[PDB]
């Protein structure tokens, strides 16, 4: 910058650390379940990969954005708190 | 040759003065007059400030006036 202290040395570093052991989830919303499976039934991790909702080889996680109106029965990892509500209130279940 | 060893320095100009003029519509919180001392005094819906900074307390219109010799800044909501 011509000789003065540049923008990448005037400013402080962003605080914190990166977690080395951070587990990451691939996210599916329960409103996407209603559009992808409008008949209900069993929904596994393999059934979400083929439907394009989620990536391969990764831990999935159901979140509760949208409106679930079908009677699905979904197995996944780590359900959300508002996603366990909408699945049972539509008539189904959610297991690990 | 000699030198001006005793002179040559100054502070920065502080950008003081009236910032919103008369009849001009302002928002709540807008600075009206920036000054040293009270060259202007607060009026209705105007507060002074920590370094005599005469801001707005209420949205309205700026109007200047006189109140027993002193000149004041007021807001008409």
């Amino acid at each position: 910058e011509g000789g003065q202290m540049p923008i990448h040395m005037r400013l402080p570093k962003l605080k914190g650390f990166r977690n080395r052991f951070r587990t990451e989830y691939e996210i599916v919303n329960v409103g996407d379940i209603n559009r992808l499976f409008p008949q209900g039934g069993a929904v596994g991790v393999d059934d979400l990969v083929a439907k394009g909702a989620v990536r391969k080889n990764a831990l999935v996680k159901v979140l509760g954005d949208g409106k679930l109106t079908a009677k699905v029965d979904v197995s996944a990892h780590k359900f959300s708190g508002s996603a366990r509500a909408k699945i049972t209130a539509a008539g189904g279940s959610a297991t690990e | 040759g000699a030198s001006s060893s005793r002179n040559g320095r100054d502070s920065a100009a502080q950008r003081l003065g009236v910032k919103r003029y008369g009849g001009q519509v302002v928002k709540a919180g807008e600075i009206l007059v920036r000054q040293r001392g009270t060259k202007f005094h607060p009026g209705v819906n105007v507060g002074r400030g920590g370094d005599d900074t005469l801001f707005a307390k209420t949205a309205g219109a700026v109007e200047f006036g006189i109140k027993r010799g002193r000149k004041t800044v007021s807001i008409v909501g």
Partner: protein, 62 residues
């Protein structure tokens, strides 16, 4: 070859969900006794990188 990113700028800038670039604020690490709490609260948190710096900062992050 392959473009190396800038190590010192990636420790100072990051991106939000929409693509804004945020930074932290200076005058906060030490000498904090004569600074009132109206000033350290002003210098707290993050702000968006200003429009006149966003072209050079985006190229340091890429």
């Amino acid at each position: 070859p392959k473009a190396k990113t800038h190590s010192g700028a990636s420790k100072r800038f990051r991106r939000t969900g929409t693509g804004k670039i945020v930074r932290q604020k200076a005058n906060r690490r030490h000498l904090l006794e004569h600074k009132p709490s109206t000033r350290t609260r002003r210098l707290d948190g993050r702000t968006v990188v200003a429009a006149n710096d966003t072209k050079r900062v985006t190229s340091l992050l890429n």
